[PDB]
Amino acid sequence: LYNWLEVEFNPLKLCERVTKVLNWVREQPEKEPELQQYVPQLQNNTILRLLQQVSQIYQSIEFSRLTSLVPFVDAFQLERAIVDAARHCDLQVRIDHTSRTLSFGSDLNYATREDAPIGPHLQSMPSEQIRNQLTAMSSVLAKA
Amino acid sequence: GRVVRLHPVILASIVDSYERRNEGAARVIGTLLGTVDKHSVEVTNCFSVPHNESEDEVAVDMEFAKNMYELHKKVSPNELILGWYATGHDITEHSVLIHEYYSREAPNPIHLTVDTSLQNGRMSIKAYVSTLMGVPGRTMGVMFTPLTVKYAYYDTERIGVDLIMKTCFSPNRVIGLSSDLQQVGGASARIQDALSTVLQYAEDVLSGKVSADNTVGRFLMSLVNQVPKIVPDDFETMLNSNINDLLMVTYLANLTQSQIALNEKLVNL
Amino acid sequence: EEDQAAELRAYLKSKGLHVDLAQIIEACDVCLVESVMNSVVSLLLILKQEALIESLCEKLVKFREGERPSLRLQLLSNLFHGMDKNTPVRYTVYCSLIKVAASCIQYIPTELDQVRKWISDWNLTTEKKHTLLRLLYEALVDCKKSDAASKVMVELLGSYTEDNASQARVDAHRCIVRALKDPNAFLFDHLLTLKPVKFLEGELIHDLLTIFVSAKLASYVKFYQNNKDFIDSLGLLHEQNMAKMRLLTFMGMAVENKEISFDTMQQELQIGADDVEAFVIDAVRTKMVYCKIDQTQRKVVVSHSTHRTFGKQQWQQLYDTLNAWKQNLNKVKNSLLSLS
């Protein structure tokens, strides 16, 4: 569980893999009943940690792809879970319903906050890269 | 621990305690505080302590040496004793007998060898220890097991020493404490010197200087690839509106302070 | 002094002066608590040093294939840390220090400016550098230091000349077929800049590199039909080689266009429609092309791409981009320092 959810950048893979761990939990509520209070609460992490990992690679996905991506909630439980990790907690996820498309990044006004999780990590969105670009000239030239 | 992690607050504290001395003696005995991960020996703060210099005799004041450990213990409890420094690359008969004192208090004492100058060299610092065992009749042969001392920088330390670094490009070792936008413009001069080195080699590595091409070749392409691409119409909505934000707080703080001042022209009546 | 050896003679007759120091070298390790080795260090380094260090460090390397090698190791850690001014025979001590390091590890200085400090100021020929950096090749492959080992191997392969590239056959096989086992060795341009490797041609594995570096998967999917025997013979399985060649066609495509659509990679890299989106993550993870998907409009926008071989165009894009960038910064270096 530390491998999948906390360390590794596998933003398509965390839907099937980490729920496979939790479907072992929902096998035995009578043999091991003591983990069963944590059965919805890990799933709240799953929607955000895909969105903290799909938003670093993708820039436009349809929502119709993503409701097939996560099998264990319906669409309206998903959609409210998307928006509180994006207004709080420093995601970039925008939602456009005219072509049903989500947009990650693509907003170059955004001043980043301090209290985001820096988790499993990739090249970030360009609002973290158009800012801190004078550093990349300053860092690599003195290495050059 | 096999690698010591010093911090550069120790070294100028050696030198400023090297310049204020009793006249004629060579060394300042004194002990150090720091922490350990048992591959990384960290040492964090320093003091000076005198001693009496004589022939085959250095008289360390064991009531004074315990005192500065206790006096810094009031500052923090969380610092264990890791060792003592002694100056010079030379080891007289004084320096062995002091090292066996601090082993009754018993860490493995993690010693440092600091110069004033190697005469055709430089300041050459090494990290020593003492540990051995005995054959009973004559056990008096002993040598120093040396390890590597390497410094470490923190972010307010590494932003703080950069202005303490600028003492060196100055005639009488003075810079008056600097402005912001001249230091913004100095950062462009920091760029302008650092641009000059890669570009001067660029007309070299274009025409003939191609033997070790790929190691500078892999680095100059990635510097141009790590900076991302917008068409500049996207940029001025970011740039000039942020300019309309920063100019707004220039008016608004002066909107406030002129009304702080005109309140102050009202209350001083 | 001399008297410590006299009670060391009493210590070793009863248990089991440069000749007397070499004789007391000859008594202890044929029997064999720590000062009996470490006052030997206090007896060795005080004195010539050449005949007695040679006899002792040979006795010290025999005992690493014997039950406890740690005690000879941590003695030799003290003695290698002892002699630091110069000797050319300090290679032979550090031969015993690398030979204990493969048979246990990593608390030894190995650094690249430091080894050229140790080669060019012991002032030996390439032939002793032939053995010292082959000593460091097998010692560094064994402790899982994969990415540092190619740097030892390329200076092994870069030590040679056109003359003695005749003997450079076996590591010339070995350096590629260890690194073609390695799925994260991404520079096959440095394996082509060697004096033996242009000299060798034929069926041997350098022929595969010209299929790898400039050439693309159309030039390799022919090559699997010709030899099933020879690529599968030495060290190499085929489908891990495939996913490297899946990358190097796509990475060389993603240099060029940066507006590139989905159907290119079903048609160049010969997979279906939904096999793309896990595969684009494989390129964006390991540091070679940082790419993005506008998946709704069926486009691959990339940020950047990395090159396989340079040219004089490739320096030329770097020049006129940087020359105005120097010139634009000339304007602001004028303008920001003129404020105060």
PDB file of N, CA and C in Angstrom, chain C residues 307-340:
ATOM      1  N   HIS C 307      17.730  14.481 -27.785  1.00  0.00           N
ATOM      2  CA  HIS C 307      18.289  14.158 -29.085  1.00  0.00           C
ATOM      3  C   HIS C 307      19.204  12.946 -29.002  1.00  0.00           C
ATOM      4  N   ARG C 308      19.296  12.238 -30.124  1.00  0.00           N
ATOM      5  CA  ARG C 308      20.069  11.012 -30.215  1.00  0.00           C
ATOM      6  C   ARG C 308      21.484  11.242 -30.730  1.00  0.00           C
ATOM      7  N   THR C 309      21.663  12.077 -31.749  1.00  0.00           N
ATOM      8  CA  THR C 309      22.990  12.498 -32.185  1.00  0.00           C
ATOM      9  C   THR C 309      22.881  13.943 -32.652  1.00  0.00           C
ATOM     10  N   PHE C 310      23.884  14.748 -32.335  1.00  0.00           N
ATOM     11  CA  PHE C 310      23.890  16.152 -32.699  1.00  0.00           C
ATOM     12  C   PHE C 310      24.347  16.339 -34.143  1.00  0.00           C
ATOM     13  N   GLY C 311      24.348  17.595 -34.566  1.00  0.00           N
ATOM     14  CA  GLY C 311      24.891  18.007 -35.846  1.00  0.00           C
ATOM     15  C   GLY C 311      25.224  19.475 -35.740  1.00  0.00           C
ATOM     16  N   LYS C 312      25.701  20.045 -36.845  1.00  0.00           N
ATOM     17  CA  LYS C 312      26.048  21.459 -36.805  1.00  0.00           C
ATOM     18  C   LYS C 312      24.826  22.358 -36.919  1.00  0.00           C
ATOM     19  N   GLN C 313      23.678  21.811 -37.331  1.00  0.00           N
ATOM     20  CA  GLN C 313      22.402  22.480 -37.091  1.00  0.00           C
ATOM     21  C   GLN C 313      22.100  22.553 -35.601  1.00  0.00           C
ATOM     22  N   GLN C 314      22.453  21.492 -34.861  1.00  0.00           N
ATOM     23  CA  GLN C 314      22.014  21.337 -33.476  1.00  0.00           C
ATOM     24  C   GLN C 314      22.731  22.296 -32.539  1.00  0.00           C
ATOM     25  N   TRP C 315      23.994  22.631 -32.830  1.00  0.00           N
ATOM     26  CA  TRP C 315      24.627  23.756 -32.141  1.00  0.00           C
ATOM     27  C   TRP C 315      24.060  25.086 -32.607  1.00  0.00           C
ATOM     28  N   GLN C 316      23.554  25.136 -33.842  1.00  0.00           N
ATOM     29  CA  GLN C 316      23.166  26.410 -34.430  1.00  0.00           C
ATOM     30  C   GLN C 316      21.835  26.905 -33.888  1.00  0.00           C
ATOM     31  N   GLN C 317      20.922  25.991 -33.547  1.00  0.00           N
ATOM     32  CA  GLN C 317      19.712  26.404 -32.842  1.00  0.00           C
ATOM     33  C   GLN C 317      20.054  26.945 -31.457  1.00  0.00           C
ATOM     34  N   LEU C 318      21.072  26.364 -30.810  1.00  0.00           N
ATOM     35  CA  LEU C 318      21.509  26.809 -29.493  1.00  0.00           C
ATOM     36  C   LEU C 318      22.159  28.188 -29.554  1.00  0.00           C
ATOM     37  N   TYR C 319      22.703  28.566 -30.718  1.00  0.00           N
ATOM     38  CA  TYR C 319      23.454  29.815 -30.803  1.00  0.00           C
ATOM     39  C   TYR C 319      22.549  31.038 -30.917  1.00  0.00           C
ATOM     40  N   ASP C 320      21.646  31.059 -31.906  1.00  0.00           N
ATOM     41  CA  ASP C 320      20.854  32.267 -32.157  1.00  0.00           C
ATOM     42  C   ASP C 320      19.674  32.401 -31.201  1.00  0.00           C
ATOM     43  N   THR C 321      19.243  31.308 -30.578  1.00  0.00           N
ATOM     44  CA  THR C 321      18.385  31.445 -29.410  1.00  0.00           C
ATOM     45  C   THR C 321      19.120  32.130 -28.260  1.00  0.00           C
ATOM     46  N   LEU C 322      20.328  31.658 -27.913  1.00  0.00           N
ATOM     47  CA  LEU C 322      21.065  32.238 -26.789  1.00  0.00           C
ATOM     48  C   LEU C 322      21.651  33.614 -27.083  1.00  0.00           C
ATOM     49  N   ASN C 323      21.903  33.958 -28.355  1.00  0.00           N
ATOM     50  CA  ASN C 323      22.580  35.226 -28.642  1.00  0.00           C
ATOM     51  C   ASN C 323      21.664  36.429 -28.444  1.00  0.00           C
ATOM     52  N   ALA C 324      20.407  36.331 -28.879  1.00  0.00           N
ATOM     53  CA  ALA C 324      19.433  37.357 -28.529  1.00  0.00           C
ATOM     54  C   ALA C 324      19.089  37.314 -27.049  1.00  0.00           C
ATOM     55  N   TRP C 325      19.092  36.117 -26.448  1.00  0.00           N
ATOM     56  CA  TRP C 325      18.842  35.985 -25.015  1.00  0.00           C
ATOM     57  C   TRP C 325      19.964  36.609 -24.192  1.00  0.00           C
ATOM     58  N   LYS C 326      21.204  36.585 -24.695  1.00  0.00           N
ATOM     59  CA  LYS C 326      22.251  37.421 -24.105  1.00  0.00           C
ATOM     60  C   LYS C 326      21.974  38.892 -24.377  1.00  0.00           C
ATOM     61  N   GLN C 327      21.499  39.197 -25.586  1.00  0.00           N
ATOM     62  CA  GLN C 327      21.318  40.583 -26.001  1.00  0.00           C
ATOM     63  C   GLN C 327      20.119  41.216 -25.309  1.00  0.00           C
ATOM     64  N   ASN C 328      19.068  40.432 -25.063  1.00  0.00           N
ATOM     65  CA  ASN C 328      17.929  40.942 -24.308  1.00  0.00           C
ATOM     66  C   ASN C 328      18.291  41.153 -22.842  1.00  0.00           C
ATOM     67  N   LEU C 329      19.171  40.311 -22.305  1.00  0.00           N
ATOM     68  CA  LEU C 329      19.643  40.495 -20.939  1.00  0.00           C
ATOM     69  C   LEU C 329      20.700  41.585 -20.829  1.00  0.00           C
ATOM     70  N   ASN C 330      21.344  41.951 -21.945  1.00  0.00           N
ATOM     71  CA  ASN C 330      22.217  43.126 -21.991  1.00  0.00           C
ATOM     72  C   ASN C 330      21.430  44.411 -21.754  1.00  0.00           C
ATOM     73  N   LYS C 331      20.201  44.467 -22.278  1.00  0.00           N
ATOM     74  CA  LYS C 331      19.340  45.636 -22.141  1.00  0.00           C
ATOM     75  C   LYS C 331      18.906  45.844 -20.695  1.00  0.00           C
ATOM     76  N   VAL C 332      18.586  44.753 -19.993  1.00  0.00           N
ATOM     77  CA  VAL C 332      18.071  44.846 -18.630  1.00  0.00           C
ATOM     78  C   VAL C 332      19.210  44.989 -17.611  1.00  0.00           C
ATOM     79  N   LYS C 333      20.397  44.431 -17.907  1.00  0.00           N
ATOM     80  CA  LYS C 333      21.580  44.664 -17.071  1.00  0.00           C
ATOM     81  C   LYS C 333      22.020  46.124 -17.145  1.00  0.00           C
ATOM     82  N   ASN C 334      21.829  46.753 -18.307  1.00  0.00           N
ATOM     83  CA  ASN C 334      21.912  48.205 -18.417  1.00  0.00           C
ATOM     84  C   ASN C 334      20.863  48.860 -17.523  1.00  0.00           C
ATOM     85  N   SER C 335      19.617  48.402 -17.631  1.00  0.00           N
ATOM     86  CA  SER C 335      18.492  49.162 -17.104  1.00  0.00           C
ATOM     87  C   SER C 335      18.267  48.934 -15.612  1.00  0.00           C
ATOM     88  N   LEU C 336      18.586  47.745 -15.083  1.00  0.00           N
ATOM     89  CA  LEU C 336      18.357  47.512 -13.655  1.00  0.00           C
ATOM     90  C   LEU C 336      19.443  48.095 -12.753  1.00  0.00           C
ATOM     91  N   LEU C 337      20.705  48.112 -13.195  1.00  0.00           N
ATOM     92  CA  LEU C 337      21.762  48.738 -12.403  1.00  0.00           C
ATOM     93  C   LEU C 337      21.757  50.256 -12.511  1.00  0.00           C
ATOM     94  N   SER C 338      21.082  50.812 -13.504  1.00  0.00           N
ATOM     95  CA  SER C 338      21.041  52.256 -13.621  1.00  0.00           C
ATOM     96  C   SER C 338      20.005  52.896 -12.709  1.00  0.00           C
ATOM     97  N   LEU C 339      19.163  52.099 -12.041  1.00  0.00           N
ATOM     98  CA  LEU C 339      18.119  52.648 -11.176  1.00  0.00           C
ATOM     99  C   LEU C 339      18.715  53.289  -9.926  1.00  0.00           C
ATOM    100  N   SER C 340      19.655  52.596  -9.281  1.00  0.00           N
ATOM    101  CA  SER C 340      20.451  53.145  -8.180  1.00  0.00           C
ATOM    102  C   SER C 340      21.906  53.309  -8.597  1.00  0.00           C
TER     103      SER C 340
END
